Write an enzyme that holds these catalytic residues in place. Structure first.
Site, mmCIF file in Angstrom:
data_model
loop_
_atom_site.group_PDB
_atom_site.id
_atom_site.type_symbol
_atom_site.label_atom_id
_atom_site.label_comp_id
_atom_site.label_asym_id
_atom_site.label_seq_id
_atom_site.Cartn_x
_atom_site.Cartn_y
_atom_site.Cartn_z
ATOM 1 N N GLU A 1 16.558 5.983 -13.861
ATOM 2 C CA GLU A 1 16.791 6.221 -12.412
ATOM 3 C C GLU A 1 18.281 6.425 -12.110
ATOM 4 N N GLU B 1 15.960 30.067 -10.158
ATOM 5 C CA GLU B 1 16.184 30.016 -11.627
ATOM 6 C C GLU B 1 16.468 28.577 -12.074
ATOM 7 N N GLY C 1 2.784 7.497 -7.903
ATOM 8 C CA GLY C 1 1.422 7.254 -7.390
ATOM 9 C C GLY C 1 0.528 8.481 -7.441
ATOM 10 N N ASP D 1 13.893 1.330 -17.280
ATOM 11 C CA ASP D 1 13.443 1.913 -15.990
ATOM 12 C C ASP D 1 14.667 2.263 -15.134
ATOM 13 N N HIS E 1 7.251 -3.924 -12.361
ATOM 14 C CA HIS E 1 8.680 -3.759 -12.741
ATOM 15 C C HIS E 1 9.219 -5.141 -13.117
ATOM 16 N N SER F 1 10.817 34.288 -24.983
ATOM 17 C CA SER F 1 11.102 35.571 -25.680
ATOM 18 C C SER F 1 12.106 35.298 -26.797
ATOM 19 N N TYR G 1 0.863 -1.207 0.000
ATOM 20 C CA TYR G 1 0.000 0.000 0.000
ATOM 21 C C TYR G 1 0.892 1.247 0.000
ATOM 22 N N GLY G 2 2.021 1.161 -0.710
ATOM 23 C CA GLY G 2 3.019 2.237 -0.832
ATOM 24 C C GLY G 2 2.691 3.165 -1.988
HETATM 25 N N1 LIG Z 1 7.436 4.171 -6.959
HETATM 26 C C1 LIG Z 1 6.958 4.298 -8.184
HETATM 27 O O1 LIG Z 1 6.499 5.350 -8.611
HETATM 28 C C2 LIG Z 1 6.969 3.087 -9.082
HETATM 29 C C3 LIG Z 1 6.760 3.235 -10.445
HETATM 30 C C4 LIG Z 1 6.495 2.123 -11.200
HETATM 31 C C5 LIG Z 1 6.855 0.895 -10.707
HETATM 32 N N2 LIG Z 1 7.067 0.717 -9.391
HETATM 33 C C6 LIG Z 1 7.148 -0.670 -8.856
HETATM 34 O O2 LIG Z 1 6.082 -0.888 -7.941
HETATM 35 C C7 LIG Z 1 6.509 -1.773 -6.889
HETATM 36 C C8 LIG Z 1 6.296 -1.099 -5.558
HETATM 37 O O3 LIG Z 1 7.164 0.050 -5.464
HETATM 38 P P1 LIG Z 1 6.813 1.298 -4.540
HETATM 39 O O4 LIG Z 1 7.629 2.463 -4.962
HETATM 40 O O5 LIG Z 1 5.341 1.480 -4.472
HETATM 41 O O6 LIG Z 1 7.346 0.842 -3.121
HETATM 42 P P2 LIG Z 1 7.212 1.388 -1.637
HETATM 43 O O7 LIG Z 1 8.542 1.554 -1.008
HETATM 44 O O8 LIG Z 1 6.303 2.556 -1.590
HETATM 45 O O9 LIG Z 1 6.489 0.114 -1.027
HETATM 46 C C9 LIG Z 1 6.075 0.123 0.344
HETATM 47 C C10 LIG Z 1 5.144 -1.042 0.562
HETATM 48 O O10 LIG Z 1 5.892 -2.284 0.489
HETATM 49 C C11 LIG Z 1 5.725 -3.004 1.686
HETATM 50 N N3 LIG Z 1 6.940 -3.744 2.008
HETATM 51 C C12 LIG Z 1 8.193 -3.224 2.206
HETATM 52 N N4 LIG Z 1 9.090 -4.129 2.496
HETATM 53 C C13 LIG Z 1 8.388 -5.322 2.499
HETATM 54 C C14 LIG Z 1 8.782 -6.651 2.743
HETATM 55 N N5 LIG Z 1 10.027 -7.009 3.040
HETATM 56 N N6 LIG Z 1 7.828 -7.608 2.668
HETATM 57 C C15 LIG Z 1 6.578 -7.241 2.367
HETATM 58 N N7 LIG Z 1 6.096 -6.029 2.119
HETATM 59 C C16 LIG Z 1 7.057 -5.099 2.203
HETATM 60 C C17 LIG Z 1 5.332 -1.978 2.738
HETATM 61 O O11 LIG Z 1 4.660 -2.622 3.792
HETATM 62 C C18 LIG Z 1 4.426 -1.062 1.914
HETATM 63 O O12 LIG Z 1 3.106 -1.558 1.749
HETATM 64 C C19 LIG Z 1 7.959 -2.153 -7.218
HETATM 65 O O13 LIG Z 1 8.010 -3.377 -7.928
HETATM 66 C C20 LIG Z 1 8.417 -0.960 -8.062
HETATM 67 O O14 LIG Z 1 9.503 -1.290 -8.907
HETATM 68 C C21 LIG Z 1 7.167 1.812 -8.566
HETATM 69 N N1 LIG Z 2 8.592 35.111 -22.563
HETATM 70 C C1 LIG Z 2 8.647 34.967 -21.251
HETATM 71 O O1 LIG Z 2 8.147 34.014 -20.669
HETATM 72 C C2 LIG Z 2 9.323 36.047 -20.447
HETATM 73 C C3 LIG Z 2 9.575 35.875 -19.093
HETATM 74 C C4 LIG Z 2 9.951 36.955 -18.337
HETATM 75 C C5 LIG Z 2 10.379 38.093 -18.975
HETATM 76 N N2 LIG Z 2 10.146 38.284 -20.288
HETATM 77 C C6 LIG Z 2 10.390 39.626 -20.883
HETATM 78 O O2 LIG Z 2 9.156 40.186 -21.297
HETATM 79 C C7 LIG Z 2 9.343 40.970 -22.492
HETATM 80 C C8 LIG Z 2 8.430 40.439 -23.566
HETATM 81 O O3 LIG Z 2 8.873 39.118 -23.944
HETATM 82 P P1 LIG Z 2 7.864 38.074 -24.587
HETATM 83 O O4 LIG Z 2 8.422 36.708 -24.447
HETATM 84 O O5 LIG Z 2 6.498 38.336 -24.072
HETATM 85 O O6 LIG Z 2 7.914 38.467 -26.123
HETATM 86 P P2 LIG Z 2 7.093 38.058 -27.424
HETATM 87 O O7 LIG Z 2 8.036 37.554 -28.451
HETATM 88 O O8 LIG Z 2 5.944 37.201 -27.064
HETATM 89 O O9 LIG Z 2 6.584 39.512 -27.826
HETATM 90 C C9 LIG Z 2 5.604 39.689 -28.867
HETATM 91 C C10 LIG Z 2 5.002 41.067 -28.738
HETATM 92 O O10 LIG Z 2 6.012 42.075 -29.005
HETATM 93 C C11 LIG Z 2 5.586 42.912 -30.051
HETATM 94 N N3 LIG Z 2 6.731 43.296 -30.868
HETATM 95 C C12 LIG Z 2 7.608 42.455 -31.498
HETATM 96 N N4 LIG Z 2 8.535 43.083 -32.171
HETATM 97 C C13 LIG Z 2 8.254 44.422 -31.978
HETATM 98 C C14 LIG Z 2 8.877 45.596 -32.440
HETATM 99 N N5 LIG Z 2 9.955 45.602 -33.216
HETATM 100 N N6 LIG Z 2 8.342 46.777 -32.060
HETATM 101 C C15 LIG Z 2 7.255 46.764 -31.280
HETATM 102 N N7 LIG Z 2 6.586 45.727 -30.791
HETATM 103 C C16 LIG Z 2 7.139 44.569 -31.179
HETATM 104 C C17 LIG Z 2 4.528 42.131 -30.820
HETATM 105 O O11 LIG Z 2 3.675 43.016 -31.505
HETATM 106 C C18 LIG Z 2 3.835 41.382 -29.682
HETATM 107 O O12 LIG Z 2 2.880 42.193 -29.013
HETATM 108 C C19 LIG Z 2 10.842 40.904 -22.810
HETATM 109 O O13 LIG Z 2 11.516 42.043 -22.308
HETATM 110 C C20 LIG Z 2 11.254 39.591 -22.137
HETATM 111 O O14 LIG Z 2 12.632 39.547 -21.822
HETATM 112 C C21 LIG Z 2 9.674 37.248 -21.052
HETATM 113 C C1 LIG Z 3 9.460 7.279 -9.600
HETATM 114 C C2 LIG Z 3 10.349 6.277 -10.347
HETATM 115 C C3 LIG Z 3 11.260 7.039 -11.303
HETATM 116 N N1 LIG Z 3 9.505 5.281 -11.030
HETATM 117 O O1 LIG Z 3 9.502 5.494 -12.524
HETATM 118 C C4 LIG Z 3 9.761 3.860 -10.657
HETATM 119 O O2 LIG Z 3 10.362 3.136 -11.731
HETATM 120 C C5 LIG Z 3 10.568 3.645 -9.348
HETATM 121 O O3 LIG Z 3 11.312 2.646 -9.318
HETATM 122 O O4 LIG Z 3 10.379 4.415 -8.392
HETATM 123 C C1 LIG Z 4 10.445 31.355 -20.687
HETATM 124 C C2 LIG Z 4 11.802 31.980 -20.367
HETATM 125 C C3 LIG Z 4 12.722 30.893 -19.818
HETATM 126 N N1 LIG Z 4 11.625 33.109 -19.438
HETATM 127 O O1 LIG Z 4 12.185 32.782 -18.057
HETATM 128 C C4 LIG Z 4 12.084 34.445 -19.928
HETATM 129 O O2 LIG Z 4 13.224 34.908 -19.210
HETATM 130 C C5 LIG Z 4 12.331 34.553 -21.451
HETATM 131 O O3 LIG Z 4 13.232 35.333 -21.814
HETATM 132 O O4 LIG Z 4 11.578 33.932 -22.216
HETATM 133 MG MG LIG Z 5 11.562 1.670 -11.140
HETATM 134 MG MG LIG Z 6 14.518 36.096 -20.386
HETATM 135 MG MG LIG Z 7 13.337 34.114 -17.272
HETATM 136 MG MG LIG Z 8 9.813 3.994 -13.664
#
Ligand SMILES: NC(=O)c1ccc[n+]([C@@H]2O[C@H](COP(=O)([O-])OP(=O)(O)OC[C@H]3O[C@@H](n4cnc5c(N)ncnc54)[C@H](O)[C@@H]3O)[C@@H](O)[C@H]2O)c1
Ligand SMILES: NC(=O)c1ccc[n+]([C@@H]2O[C@H](COP(=O)([O-])OP(=O)(O)OC[C@H]3O[C@@H](n4cnc5c(N)ncnc54)[C@H](O)[C@@H]3O)[C@@H](O)[C@H]2O)c1
Ligand SMILES: CC(C)N(O)[C@@H](O)C(=O)O
Ligand SMILES: CC(C)N(O)[C@@H](O)C(=O)O
Ligand SMILES: [Mg+2]
Ligand SMILES: [Mg+2]
Ligand SMILES: [Mg+2]
Ligand SMILES: [Mg+2]
Lengths: 340, 341
Positions: B194, B225, B133, B190, B107, B253, B25-26
């Site tokens: 990991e 960042e 999960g 898998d 797995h 941008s 039940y993990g």
């Molecule tokens: N964690 C994931 O997201 C994920 C993804 C896909 C596949 N799997 C697979 O699913 C299975 C379970 O993984 P999980 O991450 O859910 O594990 P988990 O660590 O969350 O499992 C805990 C559970 O296992 C039981 N358990 C622990 N040791 C035990 C033992 N010695 N005897 C009996 N029961 C015992 C606990 O009582 C509890 O119910 C594995 O085969 C794993 O590879 C996990």
């Molecule tokens: N994109 C992001 O997720 C993101 C994140 C944080 C900061 N910023 C900042 O925000 C500002 C806008 O970035 P964005 O990603 O929204 O841009 P974008 O490419 O989506 O901008 C498009 C817009 O700019 C205008 N434009 C384009 N060229 C122009 C020009 N020569 N003169 C006047 N208008 C013009 C278009 O008309 C439109 O309205 C930038 O200073 C960027 O660094 C962007």
């Molecule tokens: C969360 C991870 C990355 N799962 O994809 C499982 O394969 C596991 O073993 O935990």
């Molecule tokens: C989506 C990105 C990564 N933003 O963080 C902006 O700084 C940009 O310039 O687009």
């Molecule tokens: Mg795995």
């Molecule tokens: Mg930027």
């Molecule tokens: Mg940025």
């Molecule tokens: Mg996996």
């Protein structure tokens, strides 16, 4: 020590009887305008003659050219691409900005390059969201927000701070937290995330995919595991909340946790850390600034070529095949930016 | 060519008048039990005497020891840690599994190691979710699902496939897609996710933080960042839908897109690709299996030490400071496993 504003540290009182001109209606512009309108702030959109002008009109905004929007505004949010700030500022904004008006940028780049400058009798500020528009909009409608950084660059009225945090509260950033940070530090941080971290995260996903495929693994399965299933995205987003190592401790099987901790801290050579340093040097030294001015030629023609090329990379070909065969949990986005 | 089952390719008809025993039940066990119950499937929980036993009772399940649950089940889902499969199968499942009953693992590892084996007169299958999960549970309640891989290992009844896909539909995996994949390939895929990808992604984020902080950047800002804002997570999750390069083309941008495309495909030295190959060799060649068996000693004492040590890494110290200072848009995970529909 950090200055962080939440809802109790801001009010909409400074926006009473004032009009905000949202300049641009793109990714940020559309979210700012939608959230400001829904917070009961008098809002208008200034836009050039393109599809964004028509979109703003279709979504029920008062839309004019940029100059007219600025002339009838108490607060101006310059939310257009950063390379376009200089010309729009010199021609449309600077000549039309009223006495005591506030100009805000959402990125420090134009401030670093001196393309946007303090004006006598006007305020200048950065309010830079740490999130793109759709999440800012969806969070806002759910009574939540994304974080932002702010900097009061020029306060000639002595009210710039109250007005910036009023905008921040209206758009919902204070529901997360709005932290004081210099426009210069924001620029370098922001560009670093875009130039080192984002590309490297996708490069690593792509490396995982190509190694699995080369070693004879089912390409759909390879794609799903490296990100296509949403599992790695989910880990990272839940990780933002509770910590990345913590998510694995909470949600991973013991099998997964032993595997993860075998290679955690051991996967990357020093060359990756040095590349990160190289990217920062390019950002801080003006190399990227020069590169960005070049690439903005022919309306980002080179960028259009890069976007189209990326669609034919094996990862993106494999994605199209996976997404055609597996339904992904999405949310209806129809009218998301219409009045609430 | 891939064999992928969605809702129109599965039915609950095979679960009519049948009882499913959820063993454990993990992370997986709790979501399977909740979704099965809500889908109208007769579900029993089998569990040892630990907190999971008490949680299952508190959430209104029929809870017994594993042997009793198996003895009264038509379908058995072995959802406990993989290293525990062999002993539980030998002692609790194999002696108590009814004629024509189905055993499922989530797995392939226990199947590769021979710890779980086909039993004469019974069915054996893998239904392996590609998700943990809470999302499996949240998606289910939204009329959505996560993908899964399945494999029919042994099919005595000739109805193993029908019953496995019936479980998959009841838990909601067929709303995404359930693809046929061998248990051996599932195991290696898998473990690779990991042992290479997840560590590498977090190492990459951590390197980003370390380099910013070392060069005098605000540590809270650096943390936000590289992942703490949720922006990189949102990019990767939206990327799962429309593609990673496409998310940047749509949501970035022009400044962002020019920066991204400058270094995209150029950030990693050949050594990362080589390490991925090495990790895959350790997985395929038996080295990880031996390491996991050793690590499962003293009920995972080493893992407990690693978990507590990781809390003290600068990234995780910075995380706690950021999370105390910034409110994150979470969902009330309380009430998640309450009865629905
Ligand atoms: N964690 C994931 O997201 C994920 C993804 C896909 C596949 N799997 C697979 O699913 C299975 C379970 O993984 P999980 O991450 O859910 O594990 P988990 O660590 O969350 O499992 C805990 C559970 O296992 C039981 N358990 C622990 N040791 C035990 C033992 N010695 N005897 C009996 N029961 C015992 C606990 O009582 C509890 O119910 C594995 O085969 C794993 O590879 C996990
Ligand atoms: N994109 C992001 O997720 C993101 C994140 C944080 C900061 N910023 C900042 O925000 C500002 C806008 O970035 P964005 O990603 O929204 O841009 P974008 O490419 O989506 O901008 C498009 C817009 O700019 C205008 N434009 C384009 N060229 C122009 C020009 N020569 N003169 C006047 N208008 C013009 C278009 O008309 C439109 O309205 C930038 O200073 C960027 O660094 C962007
Ligand atoms: C969360 C991870 C990355 N799962 O994809 C499982 O394969 C596991 O073993 O935990
Ligand atoms: C989506 C990105 C990564 N933003 O963080 C902006 O700084 C940009 O310039 O687009
Ligand atoms: Mg795995
Ligand atoms: Mg930027
Ligand atoms: Mg940025
Ligand atoms: Mg996996």
């Amino acid at each position: 020590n950090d200055l962080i504003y939440q809802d109790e540290h801001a009010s909409l009182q400074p926006l009473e009887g004032r009009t905000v001109a949202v300049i641009g209606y793109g990714i940020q512009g559309r979210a700012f305008a939608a959230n400001l309108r829904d917070s009961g702030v008098a809002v208008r959109v200034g836009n050039i003659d393109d599809r964004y002008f028509e979109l703003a009109r279709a979504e029920g905004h008062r839309v004019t050219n940029i100059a007219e929007a600025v002339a009838h505004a108490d607060i101006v949010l310059l939310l257009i691409p950063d390379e376009a700030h200089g010309a729009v500022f010199d021609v449309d904004i600077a000549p039309n900005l009223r006495d005591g008006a506030l100009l805000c940028v959402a990125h420090g780049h134009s401030l670093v390059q001196g393309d946007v400058r303090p004006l006598p009798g006007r305020d200048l500020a950065m309010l830079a969201p740490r999130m793109y528009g759709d999440p800012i909009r969806r969070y806002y409608l759910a009574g939540q927000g994304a974080p932002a950084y702010f900097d009061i660059v020029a306060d000639h009225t002595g009210r710039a701070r109250d007005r910036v945090l009023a905008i921040a509260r209206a758009v919902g950033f204070t529901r997360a937290g709005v932290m004081a940070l210099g426009y210069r530090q924001e620029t370098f941080l922001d560009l670093f995330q875009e130039q080192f971290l984002a590309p490297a995260l996708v490069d690593l996903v792509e490396t995982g995919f190509q190694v699995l495929v080369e070693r004879g693994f089912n390409p759909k399965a390879a794609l799903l595991e490296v990100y296509g299933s949403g599992e790695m995205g989910k880990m990272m987003l839940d990780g933002a909340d509770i910590g990345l190592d913590e998510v694995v401790a909470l949600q991973g099987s013991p099998t997964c946790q032993v595997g993860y901790h075998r290679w955690r801290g051991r996967t990357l050579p020093t060359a990756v850390r040095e590349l990160a340093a190289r990217v920062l040097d390019q950002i801080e030294g003006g190399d990227f600034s020069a590169y960005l001015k070049e690439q903005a030629s022919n309306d980002y023609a080179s960028l259009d070529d890069a976007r189209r090329a990326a669609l034919k990379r094996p990862l993106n070909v494999a994605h199209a095949q996976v997404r055609a065969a597996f339904r992904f949990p999405t949310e209806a986005a129809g009218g998301l930016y219409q009045a609430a």
